[PDB]
Design a protein around this ligand. Structure first.
Ligand SMILES: C[S@@+](CC[C@H](N)C(=O)[O-])C[C@H]1O[C@@H](n2cnc3c(N)ncnc32)[C@H](O)[C@@H]1O
Length: 244
């Protein structure tokens, strides 16, 4: 699992808690700002699936009474929990080759410490969530669907996990790779009967009519830092879904 490596840990801690790159706003925060601009229901409980090191969960906790963050990576979850409990952590990022630099993530500097106690992070599989998880006013899944081995199994849980009137938000650049998703399990990104099936088409097929797409979808860009000089700069599609 690459998400258990130090290489990815430093990249994702900078992604979630570091300074911006190329003047692009922080992505977990930008995503939750859009979710909160559209949630018209109660604010008791939110779920952050594939939460990584937790920035979107802490942002949700500014408004929700309880926020549950779930990720398969124990190293990611241990970092999110240390941030919730200590308010700070330190990590390394790559400068060039073996040359590295130590950095700090700080909830208080981000105005996130006061509500960190509303979060709870746990290791879990988003394709097979525990049956004790209950249901939620809001569910966020950022950059997750194209990293799952069984997207259909993931999506099949969501109607039961969102209260009617609640909000589901999915973001993805749709970077489909057999290393992450077996081709036979793709829900889009191919032609069928000689016509294109986009990932968004697959999302609609699996979620409608239990969910209603709040049209139109929105592009949200993001920048991941790999070295001092190398970055990924990608445009995710955000789709917002109201539970019927
Ligand atoms: C591309 S990252 C997105 C992280 C974060 N939501 C963001 O937008 O920065 C994908 C995340 O999904 C997690 N993940 C992958 N497969 C998972 C699974 N089956 N169940 C739960 N989390 C999973 C990875 O550990 C990683 O944190």
């Amino acid at each position: 699992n690459p998400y258990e490596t130090d290489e990815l840990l430093g990249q994702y801690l900078d992604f979630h808690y570091g300074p911006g790159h190329f003047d692009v706003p922080n992505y977990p925060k930008a995503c939750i700002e859009q979710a909160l601009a559209h949630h018209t229901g109660t604010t008791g409980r939110a779920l952050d699936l594939g939460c990584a090191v937790g920035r979107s969960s802490f942002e949700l906790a500014r408004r929700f009474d309880e926020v549950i963050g779930i990720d398969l990576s124990r190293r990611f979850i241990d970092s999110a929990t240390r941030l919730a409990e200590q308010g700070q952590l330190q990590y390394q990022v790559t400068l060039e080759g073996e040359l590295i630099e130590r950095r700090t993530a700080d909830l208080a500097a981000l105005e996130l410490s006061n509500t960190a106690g509303r979060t709870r992070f746990q290791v879990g599989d988003a394709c097979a969530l525990d049956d004790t998880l209950g249901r939620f006013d809001l569910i966020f899944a950022g950059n997750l669907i194209d990293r799952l081995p069984d997207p259909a199994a993931f999506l099949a849980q969501l109607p039961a996990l969102v209260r009617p009137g609640g909000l589901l938000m999915i973001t993805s650049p749709y970077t489909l790779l057999p290393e992450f998703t077996p081709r036979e399990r793709w829900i889009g990104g191919f032609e069928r009967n000689g016509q294109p099936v986009r990932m968004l088409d697959g999302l609609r097929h699996h979620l409608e009519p239990d969910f209603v797409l709040l049209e139109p979808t929105r592009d949200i860009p993001f920048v991941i830092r790999e070295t001092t000089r190398k970055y990924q700069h990608t445009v995710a599609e955000a789709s917002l879904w109201r539970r019927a």
